[PDB]
């Protein structure tokens, strides 16, 4: 079955790149040691002194996360080079890292070889230290740097050519603004030709790059359809397309029937900034985020390039490693069971031996092709029994072209077929997520295509369960109800320990008539979730309101357990001013140790700041205040406030006196509770 291709087609190196699916950035240079996202160029190389670098750890941590390549920023915009280049001493050769000089590029490419992951380079065309930048001599220097990187560090699978500029820089002390004709300065054709002479197996990235294109954003999403084909058009009509001179937002979806084959890379950072920042340790993308990113990039037909910036300790930070390990666990669960492996494949037609069955081995080299006859080609998978799934994966033999243009996927439930998902492009691969179904039949219908269609993979998958922390709710009876999105086991503790994997399971609403602390956690297939911790106050069903201004709002709205219900003293007669008091008969002698005041959410009107609480056992003699003070920072942060008693008191009657407020001049209590440890 030697079938006729559909121009354009990818090359062998582009096919390998596609099959990689995903790979990593490592933004690491002197800016990592300045705190800047873009360096100026005046940095002393003294400042590149990573304490405890270790490249094996770096590459291994990335490879365990499933990334198949590492792209190192060998020189970023600041112009400082991570290897002892012969073009400048604004390199590691000047740094105290190592006795004078080591070589980060050598170590990272060596570890990439050590762990079977590809190695690629980023060499910023815009050099902000080279005093020759703007003159042809900088082009000579840049060509020598590219030769050095492409001569002594093994195979390079991708070279990353950033088209971004921005003008000013140190430029060897010039401290000047320089601009270059981006569409002609770097003379890209010859530089890239020489590079691909000494690295025939490499792939060129840039906004136009003859091999891989930029997705046109840095937020981490390609657009569906994300055609691999692409025809760059310039920003300024007439100029010649080049990195930084093309309508780049068009690179988010590609071009329908393009003239060239430049598939898309989704470069995105695990953190807001491309380089390591300490104040971003709390903003590292969660594994669920990274999986969503994986779909919105890989599962749309593009490839993923996640940036993991080593800190200025020279290591991937602990948060980054935690998130990467979680992301690997989630990708592994996603591909635990292929609900198509074991199925039968049928087709509306076939051509010269490429039968339907050929889509079950997931291999991109074996494929089904329809006959140039039926205008509605289709592929049916029949399953051994109804199976629970929600994700389909489709793939084309892209080496023969990209053919599918509009397509749908129908599922068979309860004996009947209904439409489940649809789309436009397939290309390298597409992950379609639909409604969760229990089905034993899948139909892929290729509605329209320019050339006789073909598929190399049809596989079925269950999207991993998002383990959201358990909701812990309670009524005025102490009846506690735990809940979560379905199909999760919930463990819980009431003493104060953390919910270990051997803690009490949740089953039905349980009781806690003393007031305490609940800590719950969700579980599914060995993977845990965040721990919800909730303090349950004492029951309030025997509580009656003994004293409190009624002519405006019913005081029972402050002990009804609903924070969205409001007691106030803002009657149509007047804004009756503080102090406003609530005397509560608790119905039973309670051993109170804390008082909870829940203010209103939407406003700061009526919220109290200075408070007094009296306790008694007859409601007639109160005495000195049982507690006393202010609610510091309740204006900007109106949340439930806790009055811890200096010493626990046993009492039946409680008087809460709001003495004065934050804004307005009536008192407003949303809820009022009591804790008795
Ligand atoms: Ca196949
Ligand atoms: Ca209330």
Numbering used by the authors: 29 to 705
Quote the original article.
The mucolytic human gut microbiota specialist Akkermansia muciniphila is proposed to boost mucin-secretion by the host, thereby being a key player in mucus turnover. Mucin glycan utilization requires the removal of protective caps, notably fucose and sialic acid, but the enzymatic details of this process remain largely unknown. Here, we describe the specificities of ten A. muciniphila glycoside hydrolases, which collectively remove all known sialyl and fucosyl mucin caps including those on double-sulfated epitopes. Structural analyses revealed an unprecedented fucosidase modular arrangement and explained the sialyl T-antigen specificity of a sialidase of a previously unknown family.
